[PDB]
Each structure stands twice: as structure tokens, then as C-alpha cells.
């Protein structure tokens, strides 16, 4: 079994300046993305970083793994 397979719906979103992760398996609410030093990511320009599948569609982990 691959523990990454239940993460395949994960996608990023910006809630104002907070970078969030949607689509996680066991989670009721979206949770914050963390920096490499384990802090919640807060970024005024959050929306300019988000990647898309050539439409407003957000990139999911499934999309990344199948590239």
C-alpha cells in the first residue's frame, strides 16, 4: 500500500493570505500548509503562486503524480 494514494485529492487554495490544503482524506476542515520550518504559510501574494490545469481548475496531487 502507498500512503500517498489517499492524498491524491489534495489541492492548494488561498483564503485571503493563508495558504490552505483542501481535499485531505480524514479532514473535516481545510488545514494550513506549512513552511519547511513548520509554520503556517501566510503570503500576501498567495494567489499568484497557485498552479492550474490550464483552466481555473486547481492542480491536485493526482495531477502532479500523473504528469
Amino acid at each position: 500500500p502507498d500512503p500517498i494514494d489517499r492524498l491524491r485529492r489534495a489541492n492548494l487554495a488561498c483564503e485571503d493570505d493563508k495558504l490552505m490544503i483542501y481535499g485531505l482524506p480524514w479532514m473535516t476542515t481545510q488545514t494550513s500548509a506549512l513552511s519547511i520550518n513548520s509554520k503556517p504559510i501566510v503570503y500576501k501574494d498567495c494567489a499568484k503562486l497557485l498552479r492550474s490545469i490550464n483552466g481555473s481548475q486547481p492542480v491536485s496531487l493526482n495531477d502532479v503524480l500523473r504528469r
Binding site: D2, P3, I4, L7, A10, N11, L12, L19, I21, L24, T31, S32, A33, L34, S35, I36, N37, S38, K39, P40, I41, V42, Y43, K44, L49, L50, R51, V59, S60, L61, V64
Partner: protein
Amino acid sequence: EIPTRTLDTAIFTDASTVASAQIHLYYNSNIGKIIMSLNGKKHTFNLYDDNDIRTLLPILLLSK
């Protein structure tokens, strides 16, 4: 050796600091961890640890 992936991505090196980086990563299925090489430093992510997952996923999801 375990095969690697190479990604061009953006990494939040602090809560509000982002930097472009190329990383090499691999998945060790015996221990359930992803190991990442970033500018000569090794980072380990336990895929059973939700805190580690919340750190790994933005790195993968901002990748080209």
C-alpha cells in the same frame, strides 16, 4: 538505489518567504517516507504524519 524524481518548484523557507528551487526526491516504501534534497540539505517526510504531509504537499503542489 531508489529511483528519484526531480522537480522545479517554490519552497516556503519561512512562514512568509518563498524561494525557487530544484529538488530531487524519492519514496522509501519500506519506511513510508519521502526524502528530499534541497540545496545540499536532507529533509525527511513521514507520510503517516499529518504535520509532515502539510509541509510536503505545498512543495509538490507548487511544482512545474
